Amino acid sequence: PISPIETVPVKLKPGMDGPKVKQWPLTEEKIKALVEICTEMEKEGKISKIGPENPYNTPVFAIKKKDSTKWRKLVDFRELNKRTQDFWEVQLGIPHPAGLKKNKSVTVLDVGDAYFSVPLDEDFRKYTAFTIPSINNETPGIRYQYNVLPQGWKGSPAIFQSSMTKILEPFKKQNPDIVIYQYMDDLYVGSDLEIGQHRTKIEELRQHLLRWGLTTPDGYELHPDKWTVQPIVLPEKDSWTVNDIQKLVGKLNWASQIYPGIKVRQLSKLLRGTKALTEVIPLTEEAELELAENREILKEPVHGVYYDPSKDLIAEIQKQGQGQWTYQIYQEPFKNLKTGKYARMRGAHTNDVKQLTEAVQKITTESIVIWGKTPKFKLPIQKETWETWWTEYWQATWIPEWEFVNTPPLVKLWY
Amino acid sequence: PISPIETVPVKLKPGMDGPKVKQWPLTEEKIKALVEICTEMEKEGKISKIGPENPYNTPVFAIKKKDSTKWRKLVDFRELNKRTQDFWEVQLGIPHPAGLKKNKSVTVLDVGDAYFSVPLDEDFRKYTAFTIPSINNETPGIRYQYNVLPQGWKGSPAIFQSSMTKILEPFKKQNPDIVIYQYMDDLYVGSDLEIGQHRTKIEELRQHLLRWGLTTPDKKHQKEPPFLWMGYELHPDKWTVQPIVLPEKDSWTVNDIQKLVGKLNWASQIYPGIKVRQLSKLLRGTKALTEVIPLTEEAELELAENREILKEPVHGVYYDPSKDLIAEIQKQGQGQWTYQIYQEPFKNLKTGKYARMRGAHTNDVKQLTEAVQKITTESIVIWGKTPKFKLPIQKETWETWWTEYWQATWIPEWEFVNTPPLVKLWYQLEKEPIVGAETFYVDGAANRETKLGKAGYVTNKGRQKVVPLTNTTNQKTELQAIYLALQDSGLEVNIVTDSQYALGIIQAQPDKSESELVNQIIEQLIKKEKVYLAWVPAHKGIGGNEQVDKLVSA
Numbered sequence: 001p002i003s004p005i006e007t008v009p010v011k012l013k014p015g016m017d018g019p020k021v022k023q024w025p026l027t028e029e030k031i032k033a034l035v036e037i038c039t040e041m042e043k044e045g046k047i048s049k050i051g052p053e054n055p056y057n058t059p060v061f062a063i064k065k066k067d068s069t070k071w072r073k074l075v076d077f078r079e080l081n082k083r084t085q086d087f088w089e090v091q092l093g094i095p096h097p098a099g100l101k102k103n104k105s106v107t108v109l110d111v112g113d114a115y116f117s118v119p120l121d122e123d124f125r126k127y128t129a130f131t132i133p134s135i136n137n138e139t140p141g142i143r144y145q146y147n148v149l150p151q152g153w154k155g156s157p158a159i160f161q162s163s164m165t166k167i168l169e170p171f172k173k174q175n176p177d178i179v180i181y182q183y184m185d186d187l188y189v190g191s192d193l194e195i196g197q198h199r200t201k202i203e204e205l206r207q208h209l210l211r212w213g214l215t216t217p218d219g220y221e222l223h224p225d226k227w228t229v230q231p232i233v234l235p236e237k238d239s240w241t242v243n244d245i246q247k248l249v250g251k252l253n254w255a256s257q258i259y260p261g262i263k264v265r266q267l268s269k270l271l272r273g274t275k276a277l278t279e280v281i282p283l284t285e286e287a288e289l290e291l292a293e294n295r296e297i298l299k300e301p302v303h304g305v306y307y308d309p310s311k312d313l314i315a316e317i318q319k320q321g322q323g324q325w326t327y328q329i330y331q332e333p334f335k336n337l338k339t340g341k342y343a344r345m346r347g348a349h350t351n352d353v354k355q356l357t358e359a360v361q362k363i364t365t366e367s368i369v370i371w372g373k374t375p376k377f378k379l380p381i382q383k384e385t386w387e388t389w390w391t392e393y394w395q396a397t398w399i400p401e402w403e404f405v406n407t408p409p410l411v412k413l414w415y
Numbered sequence: 416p417i418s419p420i421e422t423v424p425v426k427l428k429p430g431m432d433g434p435k436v437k438q439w440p441l442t443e444e445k446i447k448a449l450v451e452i453c454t455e456m457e458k459e460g461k462i463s464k465i466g467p468e469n470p471y472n473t474p475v476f477a478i479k480k481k482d483s484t485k486w487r488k489l490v491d492f493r494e495l496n497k498r499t500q501d502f503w504e505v506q507l508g509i510p511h512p513a514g515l516k517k518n519k520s521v522t523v524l525d526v527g528d529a530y531f532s533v534p535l536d537e538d539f540r541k542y543t544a545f546t547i548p549s550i551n552n553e554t555p556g557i558r559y560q561y562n563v564l565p566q567g568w569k570g571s572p573a574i575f576q577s578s579m580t581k582i583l584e585p586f587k588k589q590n591p592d593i594v595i596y597q598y599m600d601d602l603y604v605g606s607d608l609e610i611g612q613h614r615t616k617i618e619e620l621r622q623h624l625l626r627w628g629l630t631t632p633d634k635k636h637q638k639e640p641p642f643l644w645m646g647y648e649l650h651p652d653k654w655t656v657q658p659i660v661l662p663e664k665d666s667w668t669v670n671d672i673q674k675l676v677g678k679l680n681w682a683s684q685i686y687p688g689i690k691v692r693q694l695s696k697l698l699r700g701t702k703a704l705t706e707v708i709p710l711t712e713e714a715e716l717e718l719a720e721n722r723e724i725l726k727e728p729v730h731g732v733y734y735d736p737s738k739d740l741i742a743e744i745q746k747q748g749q750g751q752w753t754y755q756i757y758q759e760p761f762k763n764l765k766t767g768k769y770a771r772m773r774g775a776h777t778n779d780v781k782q783l784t785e786a787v788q789k790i791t792t793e794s795i796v797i798w799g800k801t802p803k804f805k806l807p808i809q810k811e812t813w814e815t816w817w818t819e820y821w822q823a824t825w826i827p828e829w830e831f832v833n834t835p836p837l838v839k840l841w842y843q844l845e846k847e848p849i850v851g852a853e854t855f856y857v858d859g860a861a862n863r864e865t866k867l868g869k870a871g872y873v874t875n876k877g878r879q880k881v882v883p884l885t886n887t888t889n890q891k892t893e894l895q896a897i898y899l900a901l902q903d904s905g906l907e908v909n910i911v912t913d914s915q916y917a918l919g920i921i922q923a924q925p926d927k928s929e930s931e932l933v934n935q936i937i938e939q940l941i942k943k944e945k946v947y948l949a950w951v952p953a954h955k956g957i958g959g960n961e962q963v964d965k966l967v968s969a
Contacts, residue, residue: 022505025792028799051423052573055501133507135799136514138596140506140576242958243848246911246951253952268956274856275958276875277848277909277949322818352823381823384788389825407821410915410922410950 008159010124012083018056018127019079023141024387026061026133033062033071034132038144046116047144048125054145056129061391069217074152075130076399081154083127090161095309096372097181106190106222106369107202110397113215114164115149115156115185128153152398157184167212171205183368185397190222190369224369230326230341231299233415234291243277245270251411252294258334261297266290305335307371312401313337315363315375317356318409325359326414329367329375338370339414356381357393364400374400380407416460418534418563418628420582423574425539427498433471433542434494438556439703445477446550448486453547453559461531465544465558473545476704478670489670490545491704492567498542502573507796509598509684512647512654513731513756513764514797518594518605520613521649523642524621524631526579526600530564530571532628533578543568572599582627586620595620602631603644610638646681655730656685661722670704672697679721686724687767693717732762734798742790742802744783746836750927752786756794756802765797776933779838779926780808780816787826804829808838816840840924842940845947852945853878854909855900856959859892860968870896872903873963893917894932901939901946908946913953913960921948 012018026034041047058080062071100106120128125145132142149156157164164182172180178201181188189205191198206216232255237244249267256262266286275281311331320326323345329338342359360377367375379386383404427433441449456462474491481487535543543561564571579597587595593616596603604620606613621631636642642649646657659682662675676691676698683689693713702708710718735758742756752769769786783806791801806813806829817824848854854875861868861884870892871881880899884892893914900910912918920933921940928934940946951957953964 020501023507025507025796026799027795027801031799051577052502052504052570053423053425053500055503057503057505129503131503136797137506137508137510138594140580140597141503143503241848243949246949250951253955264955271951271956271958272961273958274854274873274875274962276851276854277911277947278850278852278854319821319823351825352817353825356823380821382785384785385824388788388792408915408919410918 007119007121010121010155011085012127013085016083019058019083020056021058021076021079023057023059023131023133028135029065030062031133031135034060034073035142037062037071037073038132038142042144044116046146046148048147050126050129050143050145052143054126054129054143056127058128058130060130060132063391063394072217074394074397074399075128075150077128077150077152077154078399078401080127081152084153084155087155087158090158097179100179100181100188100190101224101227101370102192103179103190104193104223104225105198106188106224107198108220108222108365109187109189109202109206109209109216110185111164111182111187111209111214111216112151112185112397113217114213115151115153115160117213118149118156118160118163120146120149151185154184157182167209167214171208175201181369181372183372183398186368188369190224222365222369227340227366230339230414232413234295234298239282240280241277242271242275242279242281245281246277247411251413254409254411254413255298258336259297259302262294263290302336305337307331307337313367313371313373313375314378315367316378316405317359317363317380318407318414319352319380320412320414325355327359327363329363338366340366341414353381353386353389354393356386357390360400361394361396364396364398374398376400377402378405379403380405418532420534420578420627422534422536423570423577425536425570425574426500427542428500431498433498434473435470436472436474436491436494438472438474438546438548440548441475441477443550446548449475449477449488449547450557452486452488453557457559459531461563462559462561463540465560467555467558469541469544469558469560471542471544473543474703475545475547476670489704490543490565490567492543492565492569493701495542496567496569499569502570504573506576509645510596511765511797512649513734515649515654515733516594516605516736517733519607520610520638521603521605521636521642522613522617522638523636523644524602524604524617525635526602527630527632529575529579529600529629530566532630533564533575535562535564582624582629586623590616598645601644603642614638646685653730653732656728658728659686659725661718661725666707667710668705668707669698669702672708673704682721682725685729686727688724688770689721690717729766731764731766732758734758734764740794740798740800740802741805742794743805743832744786744790744807745834746779746783746807746838750777750782752782754786754790756790775929776920776923776925777927778924780813780840782926783808783838784824784826791827801827805832806830807832807834807836812839841926841937842924842943842946844922844924845945848909848947848949849907849945852907852909852947853905854911855904856911856963857893857896857900858913858960858963859889859894859896860964861887861889861892862969863889865969867969868892869969870899871963872896872900873959878903890914890916891930891932894920894936897921897948898932898936898939901936901943906942906944908943909949910947911949911951911959913951913957913964915950918948918950 038047059076060073062073064070064072125147128146128150130144134141149159168180178191189202191201209216245267249271252262252264266284267290270284270287308331313329313331315327315329318326323343325342327340328336330336342362344358345355348354348358364374367373377400379402381404453462457464473495476489476491478487478489540560540562543565544558546556546558549556564575583595592607594605604617624631640651643657648655648657662671672694676695679689679691693711694717697708697714738758740756742754744752744754747753750770755763755766757763769789771785773781773785787804794802804827810831855872857872859870866886868884868887869881870884873879880903884895894917897910897912897917925933925937953960
């Protein structure tokens with residue numbers, strides 16, 4: 001009640017205005033639940049109804065369905081996050097726990113509930129505006145702006161990074177061989193071994209957080225040891241057809257873009273002519289010498305490749321297989337950092353988008369644990385297609401950046 | 416003399432000041448007729464007598480007749496609107512009747528002078544200022560400024576809804592059983608009650624409103640079977656749209672086209688395929704409302720095309736949540752698609768037709784797939800749910816494309832329906848080559864300098880060919896070549912190319928296309944038995960591309 005120095009001043013990036021994204025339609029089950037969630041948030045004084053004088057808007061939706069836990073409201077703050085200023089320091093200079101990727105097990109616990117305590121700068125609150133829709137536009141629309149720190153917001157974990165270290169300090173003292181990383185709403189907790197104690201030490205941290213005032217939901221098992229890289233594999237054709245040598249030499253030319261530690265020559269010299277595709281042409285004594293340089297410099301990591309914290313990570317995915325899916329992560333083209341595979345279509349039912357979505361998340365979490373950031377995705381799907389379904393299969397607290405591509409790797413680059 | 420309703424605060428666009436436009440002199444009787452209407456509004460408390468201490472202004476014009484055949488006022492807020500802050504005028508569209516239920520009873524109130532009854536932020540009123548032009552140029556013009564929501568203004572529509580919801584809310588909590596819908600001057604009140612206890616609640620609402628300053632006149636629907644709501648005619652069992660008629664004239668003004676633009680926006684939210692693009696382009700120049708603007712060839716056709724769509728009546732039934740939603744789709748020529756969403760068999764809720772340009776080269780089932788989505792989304796908007804789909808394509812036919820296409824795809828719960836226009840994959844490229852079949856090592860190129868170029872094959876059996884083309888590009892030449900291979904070849908042929916660009920366009924299995932050449936190739940493909948398109952790089956030791964793609968190419 002003195003001089004208003006209780007809330008931290010947050011402004012938007014220079015020149016830029018606040019998000020005016022539009023709200024996409026939601027199912028009855030979804031709006032229903034959102035209405036509930038907000039009215040309580042409304043009573044709890046966390047959010048506050050606004051009129052039309054607030055030009056801004058961000059989209060909202062909920063995420064948990066069937067026989068699992070209760071509905072979790074999620075706001076897509078991507079735009080705002082891009083529009084909000086980055087805060088001088090704290091996470092910069094001194095950052096990421098490069099040991100996190102090596103743990104036998106890692107557990108992710110949502111702690112967004114913790115933001116709901118801290119109030120938000122009165123001036124900034126308008127930019128958190130969101131609207132709950134109505135079936136066939138029955139109710140004009142329920143408008144609300146957050147009064148406290150918003151979950152998916154990027155500004156929140158920063159402001160609270162101080163409060164959170166405070167909260168984490170005893171556990172990170174009492175448990176030294178336990179690595180804990182905070183990424184936005186999630187707390188990535190990981191330890192070197194399940195003596196049996198891992199799952200316990202988690203439930204222990206849950207209790208502790210529950211004690212100090214953090215209501216962690218009424219637990220995802222990650223094991224970053226099995227995370228292996230998926231390299232490029234060459235066919236073992238028994239000196240077969242020309243076509244083979246074509247499907248081979250084409251693939252190798254693409255691979256030279258990554259590394260010239262391979263040669264085109266002798267196999268390209270075996271291509272010299274016009275001999276029909278279906279001709280079982282035998283491999284010469286000079287072309288086997290070319291396969292000794294090819295296969296060698298293929299199952300091995302590239303040169304000049306380092307993670308540069310200033311650049312954005314990009315991810316590209318490919319539908320390589322009825323069950324399989326392949327992916328790559330880099331910052332500068334062909335300068336790859338990780339290349340993997342996802343084949344959980346034998347486990348989860350045969351639906352593509354679901355597979356894609358599940359994979360997007362798998363890759364992103366995988367990205368966080370490794371570099372502590374989300375990648376800009378290049379999605380092998382049509383805009384309108386993805387836009388009408390991903391939410392029905394989304395389960396993470398965050399939502400990465402995405403683009404839509406018309407797929408060019410014609411050589412079937414991996415397998 | 417102020418209304419109890421709290422006023423929504425309004426600020427301008429940041430760093431931007433208010434409207435300072437000169438008032439253009441109208442006719443003597445037009446001027447005298449303005450004072451007549453405004454002297455009315457001062458007493459009514461809608462405007463206020465303002466002095467020359469105010470720096471802002473706005474144009475005042477006068478149309479002749481439209482409601483009860485006598486004089487009416489009109490203010491040009493165009494400038495002010497640009498300077499006025501933005502609002503959340505987006506409501507995600509306009510509601511649709513097939514997204515309504517059977518209400519034992521129903522009543523529609525017309526909110527009369529709704530805008531002129533909701534108050535304006537004192538801290539803005541000075542911007543809505545207008546000087547009445549003088550007939551006797553000896554007497555200075557009487558300045559005024561609105562105190563209530565102006566008819567032409569930007570915020571007026573958004574704010575009113577806001578004011579309304581707040582006024583409506585208390586009754587709606589005390590009555591969670593009553594459906595109350597609103598849009599502009601319209602106000603739908605449906606119920607479960609019988610006429611005895613229904614006409615009651617209506618009076619209670621008309622009274623509640625009265626308390627807040629809003630008025631609903633004697634001529635309310637009084638529970639008459641045909642209801643006029645939002646340009647629709649709601650009959651007890653079905654609904655039909657109220658016929659949309661557009662103005663027909665040779666001499667058009669800025670005002671009347673603005674009007675036509677407005678009226679077309681109404682309609683688009685009811686009818687598919689309505690554009691404003693060309694007509695609105697004529698509006699862009701800040702010309703006074705009465706200056707005559709000539710229509711373009713673009714606008715004139717747009718007018719005809721719209722009027723044509725409207726020359727097609729639409730009706731339907733109401734929604735029954737108890738029953739499942741089914742949407743059926745059909746294929747038509749020119750990439751035209753049609754859908755009907757129903758509850759009971761031939762009783763359709765909504766019907767429409769999809770048409771969308773998915774690029775220059777396009778596939779058929781790629782279009783179908785886009786259709787489902789357009790419907791899905793749109794039905795979710797209208798009903799809060801996705802429909803059971805009835806699709807004209809074999810289960811095995813779709814199964815083969817999602818496993819064959821590179822981009823991810825999905826179509827919800829669907830069932831096969833047998834209607835004549837069937838969709839399929841006309842052809843199927845082989846995964847591996849054909850034995851002994853002629854293998855055409857193809858090529859094509861051109862120089863921008865000459866604008867001309869060569870194209871043609873050279874097979875394994877020795878055969879060759881080449882043709883010099885007139886107006887073509889380096890890539891279009893590479894396409895023409897594969898056609899050659901395709902035509903001058905045995906039903907089972909293998910082809911080879913250095914163009915990634917080309918390899919894909921065929922790989923994507925198009926049904927039709929924009930550029931004739933592709934269309935030509937499709938024909939060949941449909942006619943062939945087993946085709947195999949391979950790929951190999953360009954300017955290095957590639958088999959045919961060493962002999963065909965030879966330097967100084969012309």
